[PDB]
Amino acid sequence: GGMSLVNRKQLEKMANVRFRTQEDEYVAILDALEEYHNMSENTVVEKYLKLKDINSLTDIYIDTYKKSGRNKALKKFKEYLVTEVLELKNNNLTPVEKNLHFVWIGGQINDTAINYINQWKDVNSDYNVNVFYDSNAFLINTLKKTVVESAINDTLESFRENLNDPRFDYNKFFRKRMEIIYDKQKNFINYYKAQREENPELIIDDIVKTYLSNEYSKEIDELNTYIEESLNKITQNSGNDVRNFEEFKNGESFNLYEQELVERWNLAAASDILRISALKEIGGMYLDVDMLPGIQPDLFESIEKPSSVTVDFWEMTKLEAIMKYKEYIPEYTSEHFDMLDEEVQSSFESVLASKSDKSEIFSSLGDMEASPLEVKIAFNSKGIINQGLISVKDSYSSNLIVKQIENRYKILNNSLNPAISEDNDFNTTTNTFIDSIMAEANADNGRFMMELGKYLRVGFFPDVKTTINLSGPEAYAAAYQDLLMFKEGSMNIHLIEADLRNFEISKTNISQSTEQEMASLWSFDDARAKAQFEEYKRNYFE
Amino acid sequence: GSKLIKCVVVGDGAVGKTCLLISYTTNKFPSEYVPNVFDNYAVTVMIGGEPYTLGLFDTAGQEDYDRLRPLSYPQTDVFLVCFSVVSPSSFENVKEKWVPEITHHCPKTPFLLVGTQIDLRDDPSTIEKLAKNKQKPITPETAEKLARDLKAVKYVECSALTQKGLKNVFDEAILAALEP
Ligand SMILES: Nc1nc2c(ncn2[C@@H]2O[C@H](COP(=O)(O)OP(=O)(O)O)[C@@H](O)[C@H]2O)c(=O)[nH]1
Ligand SMILES: O=c1ccn([C@@H]2O[C@H](COP(=O)(O)OP(=O)(O)O)[C@@H](O)[C@H]2O)c(=O)[nH]1
Ligand SMILES: [Mg+2]
Ligand SMILES: [Mn+2]
C-alpha cells in the first residue's frame, strides 16, 4: 500500500543543502539509517528501536540548529519513519499464543458469564481458556451491594419527611446518595488500612466480612459458604487465581489493581489493569465475558435484511435467532427477533434447521498471526474499546499500555491522595481534589483532567466514564500514538479513526452485539438513572 | 488534514449532545445503547482543496462539573451551544449559563446556537405532558432572535434521530471557524 523507506543515498539527496557542513548530528542519522537496512536477520522489536534512535537523533539536530535548511527535509524524513512502523507491523508477523483470557473478580461468576465463555470453548478446542479470579476478593461485590442498598434507604429516609417533589428530582437523589456512599466507603477504607497496619497478612475477604458482620450484622457463616461456593464454581470453569499470578503481583500496577478492587469497588477498572498484564506475560486474545464468538460469514446472508430495521438491530437479531432455535445459551432474549414478520422469522427457522454442528454457526479463531509491536483492539461505533484484545506475548505495545495506565494513575493519586487524607465529607473532598486537578491542568491534558475530577463518582453516579480515560481504551490510543510518535507517555491524542484502524480485529472474530453487552456492569446513563428512582421508591414503600 | 479545527459541543444534560456526535460521525443514532469506547470524534473534510481535521469534544452539562468542564475549552475554534427545542429550561440556560461561560474562557471564539430533538416537536406524547404547564416548544424565530441578541454567528436546527439538519450544523461549524 505505502512506499519503501529511503536509503542512506536517497536521504543525502533529500536533505542536501549548499555551503553545508556535514554535522556530527546529521551523520549520526545516516549512520543509523544505513544500519536499519542491513538488519535483515533481526526481529521487528530491534528494528523498531533503531527507528526510535533515528527519530530522537533527527529531533536533537532541529533543537540545536533551529534555522538550518535541512529541518524541512528531515521532518518529511520523520513522516517516512512512521510509515515504516506500519510496514514493520504488516509484513513480519508472529503466531499468537493459543490462550483465551477472561476476567471475573469481586464475586461469584454467574451462569450467563460461563454460558458465554463455553461458546468460546466449544468452537476453539485448540485454545487454552483462562478465567482470572482473585481468591482473596470474592466479597467486594457483596460489600458494594450492602453499602449502596444501605445508602438508597438512608437517602429515601430524607425523602419520606418531605413531599412528592418540591425540588426532589432523581438528580437530588443520586447527589444525596453519593454523599452517603462516600462516608460508608471512606469508613471501610479506614477500617481496611487500620487492620493491615495491625497485621498485613490478613486477606481482603477476611477484613470485608468482619466489617460486614460489625456494621451490617452479616452472618459470617453465610459469607464463608458464598466464598467456598464461588471458589468451587470458578475452579471447575478454567479459573486462574490472580494471587498465583506472581509477575502481576510483583509488578508496579498491582497497587493500582488493589486501589480499584478494595478502595473504589470498581472491578471494570481492576479488570482493565489485569487484562493487559496477562497479554504482556502470557500472550493470546483477551475477551469480555459479554462477548460471543463471530458468526460464520455465509450464514443468514440468504435472508434479505428489511429496510425498516437498523444494521445494529439486525446484528442483535442474528444471535437471538441462533439461541432461540439452537438453545446454546438458555434465558437469552428474543425481543428483537419477536419484532420481525412471521415469514422472515421462519426464514431464520429454515436456515438454522439446516445446520447440525456449532462449527456451522460460530467461526473458529484457528491459527492467528500478529506483530510483536502491536496490541490489536476491537472497534465499536468508529471507536476503540478493550472488550476484545489480541496481543503477541511480550508485545512492545502491551508494555506501552501498562506504562500509559501507570502514568495516568500517578497523575490521579498525586491530586486525590492529599484530599482523601483529610477525612472530610464527599462535597469537601471533591472540591479539594478538583482544586489540585485545576493546578496541574493545562491545554494538553485538560480534557483528560476534566474526566479525572469525577473519579470518586465512578459506578455510583449516572454518566461518569473516567475508567475509559484512566485504565481503558484512551490509554490504548495514547499507547498506539506512543508507538507511532516514538514517544513514552502521550496525553493529547492527535490520532483519528483511520490511524487507529491499523490495529482493529476482524468483525468476524467477535460478535459484539450480545444481550449482556447492552447492560454495563460499572456505568449507567441518565435514562436508566430516572428508572432506578421510581424502582427504589416502590421497593422502599413495599 | 495538517490543520486541526477544535469544535467543543456544550449545553445542558439530556438535550442530545452525545447522540448528536454519534449520529454525525457514524450515520447511526445510538437508540440501542452507547458502548464504553474511546470517543475520538474526528472527521477529515476537504475545503478549497485543503484537508482539515474537525475535532469534536463532548462535555458534561450538569452543575456538578461547572469547574472541570472548562479544562477542555483551551484552543477551541468554534462552540456548538446546544438546547432541546422541547425543553425551554435548556433554552433559558443558553442566555443564563452557557453563553456567559464560553465568553469568560474563550472570549474571541465564535459559537453556533444549535436546536436539537426537532423530531419531538411533532411528537404526540411529549407535547401534552409539556402542555401540562405554560411550557410550549421553542419556535425557530424565538431562537434566531436570541442568536442575534447574544452575538451568535447563526441559529441551526437538527434531529439526531432523523439526521434532518444534522450535516448542516457541522458544515456551518467549520464556516464559523474560518470566517473573521
Ligand atoms: N427524539 C430524539 N431524541 C434524541 C435526539 N438526540 C438524542 N435523543 C434522546 O434524548 C436523550 C438525550 O441524551 P444524550 O444524547 O445523551 O444528550 P446529553 O445528555 O445532552 O449528551 C437520549 O435519551 C437520546 O436517546 C433526537 O434528535 N431526537
Ligand atoms: O463485577 C464485575 C464487573 C465487571 N468485571 C469485569 O469488567 C468487564 C467490563 O464489563 P462491562 O461489559 O460491564 O464493561 P462495559 O462494556 O460496560 O465497559 C467484565 O467483562 C469483567 O471482566 C468484573 O470482573 N466484575
Ligand atoms: Mg452526554
Ligand atoms: Mn461490555
Handedness of CA A170, A174, A176, A180 (dihedral sign): positive
Q: CA-to-CA distance for A491 and A320, rounded, in angstroms?
A: 41
The set of cell numbers assigned to A527 is 435514562
Pocket of ligand 2 contains residue A132 by CB under 6 Å: no
How many structural domains comprise chain A? 3
DSSP three-state, residue A493: coil
3-state SS of chain B is CCEEEEEEEEECCCCCHHHHHHHHHHCCCCCCCCCCCCCCCEEEEEECCEEEEEEEECCCCCHHHCCCHHHHCCCCCEEEEEEECCCHHHHHHHHHHHHHHHHHHCCCCCEEEEEECHHHCCCHHHHHHHCCCCCCCCCHHHHHHHHHHCCCCCEEECCCCCCCCHHHHHHHHHHHCCCC
Quick check: is A435 in a domain?
yes
- Contact call for residues A387 and A380 (beta carbons, < 8 A): yes
| Residues in chain A after which the chain is broken, C→N over 2.5 Å | none
The verdict on A204 and A332 lying in the same domain is no
Distance CA A443, CA A366 (A): 46
| Domain-embedded: residue A2 | no
Return the residue matching grid coordinates 484530599.
A419
Domain ranges in chain B?
Answer: 1-180
Please say which residue of A92, A109, A134 terminates a domain: A92
A104 lines ligand 2 (CB under 6 A): yes
φ/ψ of A170, rounded to 5, equals: -60, -25
Identify whether residues A448 and A486 lie together within a single domain.
Answer: yes
**Could you count the other beta carbons within 10 Å of the beta carbon of residue A121?**
15
Contacts of B14 in chain A (CB under 8 A): 526
Q: Residue B15 CB: number of other CB atoms within 10 A?
A: 26
Distance CA(A301)–CA(A293), nearest Å, equals 18
Considering the domain architecture, whether residues A415 and A487 belong to the same structural domain is answered as yes
Q: What does the block give as the cell for A77?
A: 524524513
Domain membership of residue A48 as a residue range: 7-92
The CA distance from A28 to A59, in Å, is: 12
What burial letters (b/e) apply to A425-444, b meaning 16+ CB within 10 Å?
ebeebbebbbebbeeebeee
Q: What is the 3-state secondary structure (H, E, C) of A375-399?
A: EEEEEECCEEEEEEEEECCCCHHHH
Residue among A77, A54, A70 nearest A20 (CA): A70
Which of A41, A61, A92 delimits the end of a domain? A92
Q: Which of B17, B19, B121 to mutate to test the pocket of ligand 1 (most atoms within 8 A of CB)?
A: B19
Residue A1 lies in a domain: no
| B57 vs A493: CA distance, rounded Å | 12
Rg (CA), chain A: 27
Alpha carbon of B16: minimum distance to chain A alpha carbons (Å): 12
CB–CB contact B32 A434 (8 Å): no
Strand order across the beta sheet in which B111-116 lies: B42-47, B50-57, B3-11, B78-84, B111-116, B155-157
Considering the domain architecture, whether residues A290 and A301 belong to the same structural domain is answered as no
Contact A332, A319 (CB under 8 A): yes
Quote the distance between the C-alpha of residue A430 and its chain's center: 25
Residue B137 phi, psi dihedral angles, 5° rounding: -55, 155
Q: Are both A359 and A380 inside the same structural domain?
A: no
Cα separation, A157 vs A168, whole angstroms: 13
The set of residues, in sequence order, having a beta carbon less than 8 Å from that of A148 and lying 6+ positions away, is A181, A460
- Whether A434 and A424 map to the same domain: the answer is yes
Q: Are residues A140 and A33 in the same domain?
A: no
Nearest Cα to A290, choosing from A511, A525, A524? A511
Decide: B160 and B166 in contact? Cβ < 8 Å.
yes
Report the run of H or E that residue A132 belongs to, with start and end. Answer: strand A128-133
Interhelix angle A396-420/A426-440, rounded to 10 degrees, is 130
Residue that is last in its domain, among A67, A92, A117 = A92
A113 contacts A267 by C-beta, under 8 angstroms: no
Is there a contact between A139 and A208 (Cβ–Cβ < 8 Å)? yes
**Which one-letter amino acid corresponds to residue A327?**
E
Cα–Cα distance between A475 and A386 in angstroms, integer?
10
Please check whether residue B59 is in contact with residue B8, taking contact to mean a CB–CB distance below 8 angstroms.
Answer: yes
In this structure, chain B runs to a length of 180
Contacts 24+ apart (CB under 8 A), A347-351: A347/A302, A347/A303, A348/A300, A348/A303, A348/A321, A348/A324, A349/A325, A351/A299, A351/A300, A351/A302, A351/A303
A438 & A475 share domain = yes
Give φ, ψ of A101 to 5 degrees: -100, 125
Distances (CA, A) of A363 to A290, A314, B10: 17, 18, 44
Distance, in Å, from the CA atom of B46 to the CA atom of A471, rounded to the nearest integer, reads 35
Residues A64 and A27 in one domain: yes
Rg of chain B taking only CA atoms, in angstroms: 16
Resolution in A: 2.8
Q: Quick one: DSSP state of residue A79?
A: H
Nearest residue, CB atoms, A497 vs list B14, B42, B68: B42
Short-list A504, A509, A508, A480, CA closest to A493: A480
Ligand in closest contact with the CA of B82: 1
Query: Measured between alpha carbons, how far is A497 from B100 in angstroms, rounded to an integer?
Result: 34
Can you spell out the DSSP letters for A452-484?
Answer: HTTGGGTTTSTT--HHHHHTSHHHHHHHHHHHH
Q: How many CB atoms lie within 10 A of CB A485?
A: 16
| A483 and A542 fall within a common domain | yes
Strand blocks (E) in A201-333: 239-241, 284-287, 292-293
Nearest 5 degrees, angle CA B45-CA B47-CA B50?
90
Query: Count of alpha carbons within 13 Å of A353, Cβ hemisphere only?
Result: 6
Tell whether A482 and A502 lie within a shared domain.
yes
Rounded CA gap, A135 and A240, in Å? 9
Same domain, yes or no: A76 and A190 = no
Length of chain A: 542
C-alpha A251 to ligand 4 mean position (Å): 26
Q: Nearest by CB to B53, which of A437, A438, A496?
A: A496
